[PDB]
Design a protein around this motif. Structure first.
Motif, PDB file in Angstrom:
ATOM      1  N   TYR A  76      -6.799  -6.017  -7.335  1.00  0.00           N
ATOM      2  CA  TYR A  76      -6.489  -6.050  -5.910  1.00  0.00           C
ATOM      3  C   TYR A  76      -6.995  -7.337  -5.274  1.00  0.00           C
ATOM      4  O   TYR A  76      -6.281  -7.973  -4.489  1.00  0.00           O
ATOM      5  CB  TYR A  76      -7.093  -4.842  -5.212  1.00  0.00           C
ATOM      6  N   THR A 114      -0.062   0.554  -6.309  1.00  0.00           N
ATOM      7  CA  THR A 114      -1.439   0.482  -5.851  1.00  0.00           C
ATOM      8  C   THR A 114      -2.323   1.560  -6.468  1.00  0.00           C
ATOM      9  O   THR A 114      -3.497   1.296  -6.761  1.00  0.00           O
ATOM     10  CB  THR A 114      -1.455   0.548  -4.313  1.00  0.00           C
ATOM     11  N   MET A 173      -2.105  -3.194  -8.786  1.00  0.00           N
ATOM     12  CA  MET A 173      -3.075  -3.299  -7.699  1.00  0.00           C
ATOM     13  C   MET A 173      -4.289  -2.400  -7.904  1.00  0.00           C
ATOM     14  O   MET A 173      -5.229  -2.446  -7.115  1.00  0.00           O
ATOM     15  CB  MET A 173      -2.396  -2.968  -6.362  1.00  0.00           C
ATOM     16  N   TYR A 174      -4.259  -1.573  -8.948  1.00  0.00           N
ATOM     17  CA  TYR A 174      -5.428  -0.802  -9.359  1.00  0.00           C
ATOM     18  C   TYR A 174      -6.439  -1.729 -10.031  1.00  0.00           C
ATOM     19  O   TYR A 174      -6.151  -2.896 -10.289  1.00  0.00           O
ATOM     20  CB  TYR A 174      -5.010   0.327 -10.298  1.00  0.00           C
ATOM     21  N   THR A 175      -7.630  -1.191 -10.349  1.00  0.00           N
ATOM     22  CA  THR A 175      -8.726  -1.927 -10.992  1.00  0.00           C
ATOM     23  C   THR A 175      -9.180  -3.112 -10.144  1.00  0.00           C
ATOM     24  O   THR A 175      -8.797  -4.257 -10.408  1.00  0.00           O
ATOM     25  CB  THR A 175      -8.378  -2.383 -12.418  1.00  0.00           C
ATOM     26  N   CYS A 176     -10.005  -2.825  -9.132  1.00  0.00           N
ATOM     27  CA  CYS A 176     -10.268  -3.567  -7.898  1.00  0.00           C
ATOM     28  C   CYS A 176     -10.274  -5.098  -7.995  1.00  0.00           C
ATOM     29  O   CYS A 176      -9.899  -5.778  -7.029  1.00  0.00           O
ATOM     30  CB  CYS A 176     -11.610  -3.098  -7.358  1.00  0.00           C
ATOM     31  N   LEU A 222       0.821  -1.200   0.000  1.00  0.00           N
ATOM     32  CA  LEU A 222       0.000   0.000   0.000  1.00  0.00           C
ATOM     33  C   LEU A 222       0.860   1.257   0.000  1.00  0.00           C
ATOM     34  O   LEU A 222       2.017   1.252   0.432  1.00  0.00           O
ATOM     35  CB  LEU A 222      -0.936   0.030   1.207  1.00  0.00           C
ATOM     36  N   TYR A 223       0.264   2.342  -0.506  1.00  0.00           N
ATOM     37  CA  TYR A 223       0.853   3.686  -0.539  1.00  0.00           C
ATOM     38  C   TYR A 223       2.152   3.725  -1.340  1.00  0.00           C
ATOM     39  O   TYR A 223       3.029   4.557  -1.093  1.00  0.00           O
ATOM     40  CB  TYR A 223       1.036   4.254   0.874  1.00  0.00           C
TER      41      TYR A 223
HETATM   42  C1  LIG Z   1     -14.230   6.352   1.945  1.00  0.00           C
HETATM   43  C2  LIG Z   1     -15.474   6.461   1.089  1.00  0.00           C
HETATM   44  C3  LIG Z   1     -14.240   5.138   2.889  1.00  0.00           C
HETATM   45  C4  LIG Z   1     -12.873   4.951   3.474  1.00  0.00           C
HETATM   46  C5  LIG Z   1     -11.737   4.812   2.730  1.00  0.00           C
HETATM   47  C6  LIG Z   1     -10.448   4.280   2.876  1.00  0.00           C
HETATM   48  N1  LIG Z   1      -9.806   3.603   1.872  1.00  0.00           N
HETATM   49  C7  LIG Z   1      -8.529   3.290   2.259  1.00  0.00           C
HETATM   50  C8  LIG Z   1      -7.569   2.685   1.447  1.00  0.00           C
HETATM   51  C9  LIG Z   1      -7.648   2.355   0.114  1.00  0.00           C
HETATM   52  N2  LIG Z   1      -8.755   2.547  -0.696  1.00  0.00           N
HETATM   53  C10 LIG Z   1      -8.377   2.189  -1.952  1.00  0.00           C
HETATM   54  C11 LIG Z   1      -9.261   2.313  -3.078  1.00  0.00           C
HETATM   55  C12 LIG Z   1      -9.462   1.918  -4.394  1.00  0.00           C
HETATM   56  N3  LIG Z   1      -8.621   1.209  -5.219  1.00  0.00           N
HETATM   57  C13 LIG Z   1      -9.239   0.906  -6.406  1.00  0.00           C
HETATM   58  O1  LIG Z   1      -8.738   0.261  -7.327  1.00  0.00           O
HETATM   59  C14 LIG Z   1     -10.583   1.484  -6.341  1.00  0.00           C
HETATM   60  C15 LIG Z   1     -11.441   1.654  -7.564  1.00  0.00           C
HETATM   61  C16 LIG Z   1     -10.798   2.525  -8.621  1.00  0.00           C
HETATM   62  C17 LIG Z   1     -10.698   2.106  -5.125  1.00  0.00           C
HETATM   63  C18 LIG Z   1     -11.866   2.882  -4.601  1.00  0.00           C
HETATM   64  C19 LIG Z   1      -6.989   1.732  -1.964  1.00  0.00           C
HETATM   65  C20 LIG Z   1      -6.222   1.258  -3.161  1.00  0.00           C
HETATM   66  C21 LIG Z   1      -6.539   1.835  -0.668  1.00  0.00           C
HETATM   67  C22 LIG Z   1      -5.182   1.467  -0.135  1.00  0.00           C
HETATM   68  C23 LIG Z   1      -4.322   2.669   0.223  1.00  0.00           C
HETATM   69  C24 LIG Z   1      -3.495   3.173  -0.920  1.00  0.00           C
HETATM   70  O2  LIG Z   1      -3.934   3.862  -1.818  1.00  0.00           O
HETATM   71  O3  LIG Z   1      -2.252   2.789  -0.848  1.00  0.00           O
HETATM   72  C25 LIG Z   1      -8.350   3.782   3.572  1.00  0.00           C
HETATM   73  C26 LIG Z   1      -7.089   3.730   4.392  1.00  0.00           C
HETATM   74  C27 LIG Z   1      -6.946   2.445   5.183  1.00  0.00           C
HETATM   75  C28 LIG Z   1      -5.528   2.155   5.584  1.00  0.00           C
HETATM   76  O4  LIG Z   1      -5.179   1.984   6.734  1.00  0.00           O
HETATM   77  O5  LIG Z   1      -4.709   2.102   4.567  1.00  0.00           O
HETATM   78  C29 LIG Z   1      -9.542   4.386   3.960  1.00  0.00           C
HETATM   79  C30 LIG Z   1      -9.800   5.022   5.293  1.00  0.00           C
HETATM   80  N4  LIG Z   1     -12.971   5.006   4.843  1.00  0.00           N
HETATM   81  C31 LIG Z   1     -14.253   5.225   5.281  1.00  0.00           C
HETATM   82  O6  LIG Z   1     -14.571   5.422   6.440  1.00  0.00           O
HETATM   83  C32 LIG Z   1     -15.173   5.287   4.081  1.00  0.00           C
HETATM   84  C33 LIG Z   1     -16.287   4.255   4.182  1.00  0.00           C
END
Ligand SMILES: *[C@H](C)[C@H]1/C(=C/c2[nH]c(/C=C3N=C(/C=C4\NC(=O)C(CC)=C4C)C(C)=C\3CCC(=O)O)c(CCC(=O)O)c2C)NC(=O)[C@@H]1C
Ligand SMILES: *[C@@H](C)[C@H]1/C(=C/c2[nH]c(/C=C3N=C(/C=C4\NC(=O)C(CC)=C4C)C(C)=C\3CCC(=O)O)c(CCC(=O)O)c2C)NC(=O)[C@@H]1C
Ligand SMILES: *[C@H](C)[C@H]1/C(=C/c2[nH]c(/C=C3N=C(/C=C4\NC(=O)C(CC)=C4C)C(C)=C\3CCC(=O)O)c(CCC(=O)O)c2C)NC(=O)[C@@H]1C
Ligand SMILES: *[C@H](C)[C@H]1/C(=C/c2[nH]c(/C=C3N=C(/C=C4\NC(=O)C(CC)=C4C)C(C)=C\3CCC(=O)O)c(CCC(=O)O)c2C)NC(=O)[C@@H]1C
Ligand SMILES: *[C@H](C)[C@H]1/C(=C/c2[nH]c(/C=C3N=C(/C=C4\NC(=O)C(CC)=C4C)C(C)=C\3CCC(=O)O)c(CCC(=O)O)c2C)NC(=O)[C@@H]1C
Ligand SMILES: *[C@H](C)[C@H]1/C(=C/c2[nH]c(/C=C3N=C(/C=C4\NC(=O)C(CC)=C4C)C(C)=C\3CCC(=O)O)c(CCC(=O)O)c2C)NC(=O)[C@@H]1C
Ligand SMILES: *[C@H](C)[C@H]1/C(=C/c2[nH]c(/C=C3N=C(/C=C4\NC(=O)C(CC)=C4C)C(C)=C\3CCC(=O)O)c(CCC(=O)O)c2C)NC(=O)[C@@H]1C
Ligand SMILES: *[C@H](C)[C@H]1/C(=C/c2[nH]c(/C=C3N=C(/C=C4\NC(=O)C(CC)=C4C)C(C)=C\3CCC(=O)O)c(CCC(=O)O)c2C)NC(=O)[C@@H]1C
Ligand SMILES: CCC1=C(C)/C(=C/C2=NC(=C\c3[nH]c(/C=C4\NC(=O)C(C)=C4CC)c(C)c3CCC(=O)O)/C(CCC(=O)O)=C2C)NC1=O
Ligand SMILES: [Cl-]
Lengths: 67, 167, 593, 156, 161, 156, 161, 159
Positions: free
Chosen positions: G78, G66, G72-75, G61-62
């Motif tokens: 994942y 991702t 790791m994109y395009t759920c 992650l991060y």
């Molecule tokens: C917000 C509506 C809700 C929420 C969100 C939340 N999400 C993360 C971490 C990630 N979310 C994603 C998302 C996506 N990847 C995809 O391919 C898609 C479709 C295009 C989506 C939506 C990803 C990849 C992550 C991982 C982190 C990253 O980008 O590296 C978190 C953080 C959790 C953590 O500890 O990492 C959170 C908080 N939280 C809520 O309360 C809402 C319900």
């Protein structure tokens, strides 16, 4: 096989050697007959002054047995 | 292969002579060649500025790459990424002169994804920076006076399409 | 869209520590580290006390160090982002100083600092060097400077300032050797980070042990390993001509190449193309750059033998440009020069010591098939395609003779399969069907010969299902499902198999056709991975394709194959591809009119 | 060929050729003389069989592309009739209709629809060619050839 | 698969003619070897298991291939070898009765060398075993029908080789 | 082995091993000391169980190819008896009949029918070795060996 | 599916004798590590989803692997990566319990490199994910069972790298 | 990559100074380094004798040195000896580094494919390497033998 004793100094004109890529240019080298034409052409292509070409091995006018 | 040699090779492989559609396409490419050479000249004059400023804009929009997690964090990796930017700009300029993506096919897309997966290089910042390069060359071409920015649009889009994934 | 050359695991070195450099030297000399390298490691581990406590005190006082750190700039005029980057750069420089102190080498500083003069906007370089000098002064101010390691901290800060004062250093260039070879550029940071490779130069006045070291490195380059300990390296005339005043390292490379040791190693077990690739490794230190280079080499071998190829490689312009006259060829990999993306996979599979473990020539296949459309292959490579025989899950092993051509197919891509329906006729394919070939017993036997391509032993008989089907309690489809849920089927096609290979071979036995694309294979692999073997068997029997083709009362039969399967099923060639030219007339025999 | 049907029947159920398959095999290998004689006769009178079949075919159903005045179309039709009766000879020698099927009657329908020739015209011409094969052969040989002619008739 | 009549017919059809005279006497040779081919097939079918018994007893038994570490150790491997021999003999009967080696091409020798090399089945010993089977079937069918079936057995051996 | 049956049972349903499977695993690794003892005893007295088995197997059924005068066939019978008691020891150590099946009792019938040795005489000889394994092993060990000897009797 | 018992039996069986004393010592070693192997497998079974959550948290992650355009994109991708990570955990556990990594070698590592090179899956990244999983199991189990299961995690990485 | 490289790699990836646990890991490496070096020296001076003893106790008088075995045909024996020397010296490299990265990058990658292509028994190799672990243990001492048997076990893990 009949050999050529060749002394030549082939300079570099397209690259700067940094500290390790520098090797040497003034080489005296035994050259096989079947490659000496290509070595002469190669060191003429890179721009080398060929100062010494002699026949290290073999005789002149050999109809056979020269390799 | 430029447009001329690619079209000629296609007709050679099918055995036809030149029909009038080929003559029209060849004449079209020959007319666009003045604009292509003009863009190659501006590129050869402003290539370092274009590639480096595209890298800077990419690192501003994608902040993580210069952050410690990213694969362009140190100045070794930063210089490697900017050299890749210069690679893309130079071969896209080659394709701009040729008008064909064969140069890109054999010398840019010949294993770029394999290298970027071996080294951990992110693909999508690479194509984002390629698009920043394309918009940059587009805008200084428009300022230079070239109304047709269609030619300079194609090589960066081809590199982006062949490099990017499928969503 | 295009075939894959392989993405091998690469570890690019960002710098060198003290142990990594010593082990790199000892490894690149093929020996245990010696007493002075031993003293390197032991003396650096001795200073490790002082180095770790220096890093401790610098990390402890970092906040005040960068707080303390010409015309001083204004915060508001500079910008918030640029002020943020000034502070970030200053803390970064201090961090890298502590990194160098613990690592015992300034390679991290020198690599990451030397080409920073114009990266930092170069109108603030006086401010940068003043801030770095003030950090040096403060770091020494709270680290007592009489005779302690404050001399070390002063030296490391001085090295950092000296690297940063170096102006624009020229990028290294791997110039294109031909019209087909692209030229590459190389940052000097990437050059200095790369692992140090010894440059074995043999001069006529070297001592004997240095000469023997150069000979051993020549063996390691050409024969891939040290052969001098063995009596096969009895080449006393080439060695003796090489040592004194004549027969220089280039002639010796040629003599090693034309020797029968090299032929036994890299020409006798290989076809010509793989042999050419290995020769490219062993005489130029790099793989095939392009297809046209391989055309030149292959035509030359075809009319003149492999020894002439060795002669042409060591007689080439590139050889004299890199290795000259008296330099041993060295492997030109990641940090040695700029690498091309064109041959990345094949050349990193070639520089690996397991390059002779592959027989199929990796460069020509990748280079040719990049300029071709997608091949007829299972989506997860060609190892997932089993052998189209009557029985037996025969897959190509990934390790035993790797003949792997990775290819990326899209999710919607579909395989072209040669069906037996359009081919042949009817009453020619309805002999291999076995519906309800009306006797029950024959239908049990044919259901076996589909589920297990040959008739099975009595212990593998599912006799309860036999009694059920003889009584009419279950139909043919349920019997086939019970045979495919028997234990011996699991042993034959599920346990001793890669999971997607297992799914593919069960699909071929239960459906009579290979899968089409990543839709089908993805669904079956997901089913058998989240649910298991019996779930995949039930999903394949209850698959709509089974119901459309084999229904409920019909034993499954082969319906489609890969084209490789028919190429196997026609070793004399296909039937009539173009009219033959029996009794032809050629020139020369006609001209003698 | 019937040997191939016997082997693929002995195959595909993993068993050696049964006595009955060998019995059909000896019956066929003894009828081979009559099959050779029939095939030789057909190869001898192929040309006049095609000409008389065309005579009856153009007499009975004249609204075909063969007699639209173009000599190339009727040359193609002549050659097609000769090829079909050659396939009849092949199936006679082989003892089974598989040569006929695999050479001329597997994708026959879509072939003639791509060639735009109506199917029932080909069936009428094959009825004519069947009558010509009746007229030039003895009763047993007429039955042997007419079975494969009926095989073509079903296939259209 | 193909047989002798089928391949003669297909070569003549590829040329676009009838069965010429040379293919005709080839077909007479077939049509007069048919009765002895059928009797040889019947005699092989009467004694298939006995042929495999003598074959293994004379070629594979009392060697390291059957002891521990050999290919025929671990009884199911012996059964797999025996079933492969049943396949070789049955398909040799198919090719003998058919008069063409086509069935061996499409159902035996396709991928068989690859299969055996994948399994570690020694191929030279398999060639030795198939030729031992050739001797066993040459023993009690006679020279002539034995020579006819040994032709297809040698084709099997060439395909393995 | 019992471990391999537990892993393969945990496999094919895509789930981790249950508490019951791991409970059987703890019981088995506790019993492993007794199983090693049984294996050592069988490896120590293999020679004499084979000799006495041959003794009483010839005293009960002499109509076998073993005692037909060829001493090579007697050597083969002795070696087969020794291999099968060794396979029983392997099943003792493994705790499942998997070494007994996979090496010994899958292709029993095809192997011994190809070898021309009749099946049920081998069944008798295996009963003989079962009685000797009673005669030399303690009661729990005798039952543990008896499970696999009865598996052998099922196999033939 | 081969285990330490079955590997020992098969090396003794290929030579043709009973298991010898050093093999019996290895057998005793397995017989006395079985209890901790079972306890570790039960803990892994209880906390496998927590392991995979933590593993992806600290390693995948991060990073822009991702974000958009990552692998790791395009759920669905994942979910595919999570499902693969679950499979590596389960098969490392299967190899750990049985004592040998034959299940890894025959079910995962044979063709997974070809599959990941074909899909464009970054192999170095999934090696990093496997060793992050190894460290997570090291953290919540201890040293001894931790190094025992990290043995086969490192075997997975070797089959990948 | 040694232990210092992997530690600074983690610290620079998280973008901080060397943390106290990281400094403690470096402390364990740095103050076990002298016994590591000593073990490296005596492993260098006695590599041939170790390889001799390990072939003697693990790979001799089995049927892999006999006819049809994998260490028949004397050049295959010399190749076997050289593979044992490579394993000893690269385990030494890893021991001096403190990390198994030199193993993963120079031995274990490339080895399984080579051995399965050449037909080399993996099991005989791992039993030879574990005999190497025992021999180095016996001639070194429990601590140094364990510290180098960790890397010998990493090599056995990759096999
Ligand atoms: C917000 C509506 C809700 C929420 C969100 C939340 N999400 C993360 C971490 C990630 N979310 C994603 C998302 C996506 N990847 C995809 O391919 C898609 C479709 C295009 C989506 C939506 C990803 C990849 C992550 C991982 C982190 C990253 O980008 O590296 C978190 C953080 C959790 C953590 O500890 O990492 C959170 C908080 N939280 C809520 O309360 C809402 C319900
Ligand atoms: C910005 C562009 C991104 C980025 C780049 C980055 N790349 C590398 C390393 C290499 N890049 C290449 C590329 C090419 N070689 C070719 O022949 C072609 C066509 C002309 C291309 C595009 C290669 C081969 C390498 C390997 C090293 C070499 O110089 O030969 C790095 C360094 C990798 C490392 O960690 O060592 C980097 C940083 N990084 C980002 O974050 C941007 C998305
Ligand atoms: C001729 C019978 C058919 C044919 C041939 C054809 N081949 C190529 C190209 C190559 N062929 C090879 C072959 C080999 N490599 C080896 O090591 C050996 C030695 C035992 C062989 C036989 C290779 C490597 C190439 C590539 C190098 C080269 O082009 O010379 C071509 C050209 C393909 C192209 O795209 O240029 C052709 C035409 N083609 C037919 O149609 C015939 C049926
Ligand atoms: C016996 C003479 C030799 C021998 C044989 C042996 N074979 C196997 C295993 C298999 N044999 C096949 C063969 C075929 N599949 C087909 O479709 C056909 C015709 C094209 C054949 C001949 C297959 C596929 C297998 C594997 C699956 C199966 O067993 O059914 C073994 C077992 C080896 C193993 O490890 O499984 C053996 C021992 N061995 C000898 O020593 C003889 C020379
Ligand atoms: C003795 C109890 C019975 C008996 C024995 C007998 N056996 C043979 C010959 C062979 N036996 C085998 C057996 C095996 N092969 C394997 O791989 C396994 C291990 C699980 C077994 C048990 C084999 C293969 C042979 C052939 C020789 C060889 O090993 O190469 C004979 C001799 C037959 C002959 O003349 O060839 C005999 C007599 N006979 C009886 O009557 C007893 C019931
Ligand atoms: C996750 C840690 C990393 C990652 C993974 C990833 N994998 C896929 C797709 C597939 N993975 C497999 C793997 C296996 N097949 C087997 O039989 C086994 C079990 C022993 C394994 C592990 C397969 C076959 C697929 C293909 C599935 C399909 O056809 O959809 C993906 C998705 C690929 C895509 O483009 O959809 C991903 C993302 N990716 C990362 O970045 C991680 C480092
Ligand atoms: C006898 C002339 C001399 C002698 C012999 C001796 N040899 C050994 C042990 C072995 N010898 C070999 C030899 C070979 N294996 C092969 O594959 C080849 C090619 C055909 C050869 C030559 C091997 C491998 C061994 C090890 C045993 C084994 O097979 O596993 C010994 C024993 C040494 C020891 O330490 O035990 C001896 C004594 N001794 C003399 O004094 C003579 C000069
Ligand atoms: C010996 C104890 C075991 C064994 C070994 C064996 N190896 C080979 C051949 C090779 N081994 C290697 C491996 C390496 N070379 C290296 O440089 C490195 C270190 C970086 C390794 C790991 C290679 C590349 C080969 C190929 C040829 C060569 O000799 O260099 C053989 C010969 C195999 C053959 O048939 O040629 C052998 C015998 N075999 C055993 O049975 C032992 C368990
Ligand atoms: C040795 C560790 C290291 C450092 C410090 C480094 C330098 C660096 N700072 C950089 C840049 C700057 N440093 C600075 C600032 C300073 N750098 C300094 O050390 C000081 C005292 C100054 C003058 C105030 C600025 C203004 C930039 C502009 C960045 C841009 O062009 O967008 C960059 C470019 C990448 C980025 O924006 O993050 C690099 C590569 N790279 C390294 O590897
Ligand atoms: Cl220092």
């Amino acid at each position: 096989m009949r050999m050529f004793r060749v002394t030549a100094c082939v300079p570099s004109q397209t690259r700067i050697r940094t500290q390790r890529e520098l090797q040497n240019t003034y080489f005296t080298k035994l050259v096989p007959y079947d490659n000496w034409f290509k070595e002469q052409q190669r060191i003429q292509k890179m721009g080398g002054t060929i100062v010494k070409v002699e026949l290290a091995t073999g005789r002149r006018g050999a109809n056979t047995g020269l390799a | 292969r430029d447009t001329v040699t690619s079209l000629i090779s296609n007709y050679d492989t099918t055995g036809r002579y030149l029909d009038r559609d080929a003559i029209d396409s060849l004449q079209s490419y020959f007319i666009t060649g003045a604009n292509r050479v003009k863009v190659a000249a501006m590129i050869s004059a402003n290539a370092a500025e274009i590639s480096r400023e595209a890298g800077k804009k990419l690192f501003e929009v994608v902040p993580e790459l210069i952050r410690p997690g990213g694969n362009a964090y140190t100045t070794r990796r930063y210089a490697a990424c900017l050299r890749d930017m210069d690679y893309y700009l130079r071969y896209s300029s080659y394709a701009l002169v040729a008008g064909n993506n064969d140069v890109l096919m054999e010398r840019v897309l010949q294993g770029l994804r394999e290298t970027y997966n071996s080294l951990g290089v992110p693909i999508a910042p690479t194509v984002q920076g390629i698009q920043i390069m394309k918009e940059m060359v587009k805008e200084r071409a428009s300022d230079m006076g070239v109304d047709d920015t269609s030619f300079i649009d194609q090589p960066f889009d081809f590199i982006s399409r062949e490099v990017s994934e499928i969503s | 869209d295009r075939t894959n050359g392989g993405s091998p695991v690469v570890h690019p070195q960002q710098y060198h520590t003290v142990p990594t450099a010593v082990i790199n030297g000892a490894h690149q000399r093929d020996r245990y580290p010696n007493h002075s390298e031993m003293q390197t490691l032991s003396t650096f581990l001795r200073t490790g006390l002082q180095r770790l406590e220096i890093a401790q005190t610098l990390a402890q006082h970092a906040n005040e160090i960068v707080a303390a750190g010409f015309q001083a700039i204004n915060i508001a005029d500079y910008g918030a982002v640029r002020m943020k980057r000034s502070m970030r750069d200053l803390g970064w420089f201090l961090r890298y100083i502590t990194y160098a102190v613990v690592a015992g080498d300034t390679s991290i500083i020198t690599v990451n600092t030397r080409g920073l003069r114009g990266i930092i906007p170069e109108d603030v370089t006086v401010a940068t060097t003043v801030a770095l000098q003030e950090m040096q002064w403060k770091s020494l101010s709270f680290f007592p400077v009489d005779s302690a390691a404050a001399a070390l901290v002063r030296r490391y800060f001085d090295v950092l300032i000296a690297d940063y004062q170096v102006e624009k250093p020229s990028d290294r260039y791997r110039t294109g050797v031909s019209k087909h070879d692209q030229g590459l550029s190389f940052p000097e940071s990437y050059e200095d980070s790369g692992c140090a490779i010894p440059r074995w130069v043999m001069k006529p006045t070297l001592p004997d042990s240095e000469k023997d070291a150069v000979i051993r490195a020549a063996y390691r380059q050409v024969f891939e390993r040290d052969i001098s300990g063995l009596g096969t390296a009895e080449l006393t005339q080439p060695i003796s001509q090489l040592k004194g005043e004549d027969g220089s390292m280039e002639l010796f490379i040629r003599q090693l190449g034309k020797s029968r040791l090299y032929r036994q190693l890299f020409y006798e077990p290989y076809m010509i193309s793989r042999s050419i690739e290995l020769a490219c490794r062993h005489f130029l230190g790099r793989g095939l750059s392009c297809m046209e280079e391989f055309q030149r080499y292959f035509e030359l071998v075809a009319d003149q033998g492999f020894s002439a190829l060795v002669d042409a490689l060591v007689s080439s312009q590139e050889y004299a440009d890199y290795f000259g006259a008296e330099t041993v060829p060295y492997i030109r990999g990641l940090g040695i020069e700029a690498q091309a993306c064109r041959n990345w996979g094949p050349q990193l599979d070639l520089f690996k010591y397991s390059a002779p473990a592959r027989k199929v020539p990796q460069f020509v296949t990748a280079f040719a098939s990049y300029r071709q459309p997608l091949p007829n292959q299972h989506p997860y490579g060609m190892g997932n395609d089993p052998l189209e025989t009557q029985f037996g899950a025969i897959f190509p092993h990934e390790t035993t003779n790797p003949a792997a051509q990775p290819v990326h197919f899209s999710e919607d891509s579909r395989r072209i399969l040669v069906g037996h329906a359009h081919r042949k006729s009817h009453a020619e394919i309805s002999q291999q069907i076995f519906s309800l070939q009306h006797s029950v017993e024959s239908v049990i036997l044919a259901a076996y010969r589909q589920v297990f391509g040959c008739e099975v032993l009595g212990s593998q008989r599912h006799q309860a299902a036999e009694t059920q089907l003889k009584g009419g309690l279950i139909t043919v489809r349920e019997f086939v499902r019970q045979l495919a849920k028997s234990r011996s089927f699991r042993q034959a096609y599920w346990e001793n198999l890669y999971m997607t290979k297992a799914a593919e071979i069960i699909h071929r036995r239960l459906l009579g056709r290979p899968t089409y694309g990543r839709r089908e294979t993805s669904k079956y692999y997901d089913i058998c991975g989240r649910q298991g073997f019996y779930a995949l068997v039930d999903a394949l029997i209850d698959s709509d394709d089974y119901r459309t083709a084999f229904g409920e009362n019909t034993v499954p039969y082969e319906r489609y194959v890969t084209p490789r399967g028919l190429a196997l099923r026609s070793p004399k060639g296909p039937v009539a591809i173009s009219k033959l030219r029996d009794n032809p007339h050629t020139v020369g025999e006609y001209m003698m009119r | 060929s019937l040997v191939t049907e016997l082997i693929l029947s002995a195959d595909s159920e993993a068993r050696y050729p049964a006595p009955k398959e060998l019995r059909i095999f000896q019956d066929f290998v003894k009828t081979g003389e009559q099959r050779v004689r029939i095939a030789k006769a057909l190869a001898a009178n192929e040309e006049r069989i095609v000409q008389n079949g065309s005579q009856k075919f153009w007499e009975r159903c004249p609204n075909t592309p063969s007699n639209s005045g173009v000599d190339r179309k009727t040359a193609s039709c002549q050659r097609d009739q000769g090829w079909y009766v050659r396939l009849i000879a092949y199936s006679i020698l082989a003892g089974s209709e598989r040569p006929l099927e695999d050479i001329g009657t597997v994708g026959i329908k879509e072939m003639y629809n791509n060639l735009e020739i109506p199917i029932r015209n080909i069936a009428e011409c094959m009825r004519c060619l069947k009558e010509e094969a009746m007229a030039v052969l003895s009763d047993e040989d007429a039955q042997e050839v007419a079975a494969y002619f009926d095989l073509i008739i079903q296939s259209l | 698969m193909q047989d002798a009549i089928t391949t003669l017919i297909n070569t003549s059809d590829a040329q676009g003619k009838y069965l010429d005279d040379s293919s005709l006497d080839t077909l007479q040779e077939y049509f007069r070897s048919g009765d002895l081919r059928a009797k040889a097939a019947m005699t092989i079918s009467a004694n298939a298991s006995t042929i495999v018994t003598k074959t293994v007893a004379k070629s594979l038994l009392y060697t390291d291939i059957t002891g521990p570490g050999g290919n025929m150790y671990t009884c199911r491997r012996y059964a797999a070898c025996i079933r492969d021999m049943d396949f070789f003999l049955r398909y040799g009967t198919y090719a003998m009765l058919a008069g063409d080696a086509s069935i061996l091409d499409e159902r035996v020798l396709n991928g068989l060398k690859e299969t055996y090399n994948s399994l570690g089945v020694p191929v030279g010993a398999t060639i030795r075993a198939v030729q031992a089977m050739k001797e066993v079937v040459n023993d009690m069918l006679g020279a002539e029908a034995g020579k006819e079936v040994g032709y297809y057995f040698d084709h099997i051996c060439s395909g393995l080789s």
